[PDB]
Design a protein around this ligand. Structure first.
Ligand SMILES: NC(=O)[C@H]1CCCN(C(=O)[C@H](OCC2CCCC2)c2ccccc2)C1
Ligand SMILES: [Zn+2]
Length: 139
């Protein structure tokens, strides 16, 4: 679990969004595994606006942060689940690292701020849903 709080927005994994998230829906993209809902309290997370390929992510299944090198956002294949059919997830970045179910929502950060959130795992890889292109989160 985990979320990003920026301005009057809350960014979460779409497959973990709550009834309150869907009742205050601003935007969702199943192909990205992202959902953004509105909040009343102001958020103070800073979103990174960059092309970094190195950063640090929080891994809840190890209670630890790990430094990683990660790929540029791209269309990558993902298998089925209580949540999705086998499909290509867009705007996804992979790194070599530990990720298991429960780790979704962990934040990946670079020196510029929040880059994305854990969205996929397995086979010794971790995949992050990028949020750096969502320029509207800042206004
Ligand atoms: N964005 C998606 O479509 C994801 C939805 C949840 C599921 N998912 C995954 O990639 C992994 O879960 C299934 C594996 C298969 C073998 C053991 C569990 C996973 C998720 C999070 C962290 C680590 C691993 C795909
Ligand atoms: Zn950066």
């Amino acid at each position: 679990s985990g979320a990003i709080y920026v301005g009057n927005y809350r960014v979460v994994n779409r497959h973990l969004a709550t009834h309150n998230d869907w009742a205050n829906l601003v935007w969702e993209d199943s192909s990205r595994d992202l959902l953004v809902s509105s909040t009343t309290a102001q958020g103070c997370d800073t979103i990174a606006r960059c092309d970094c390929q190195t950063g640090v992510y929080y891994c809840s299944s190890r209670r630890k942060h790990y430094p990683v090198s990660f790929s540029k956002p791209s269309l990558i294949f993902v298998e089925a689940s209580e949540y999705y059919p086998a499909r290509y997830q867009s705007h996804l970045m992979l790194a070599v690292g530990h990720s298991e179910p429960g780790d979704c929502g962990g934040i990946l950060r670079c020196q510029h701020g929040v880059v994305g959130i854990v969205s996929t795992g397995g086979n010794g890889l971790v995949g992050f849903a990028d949020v750096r292109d969502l320029l509207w989160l800042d206004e």
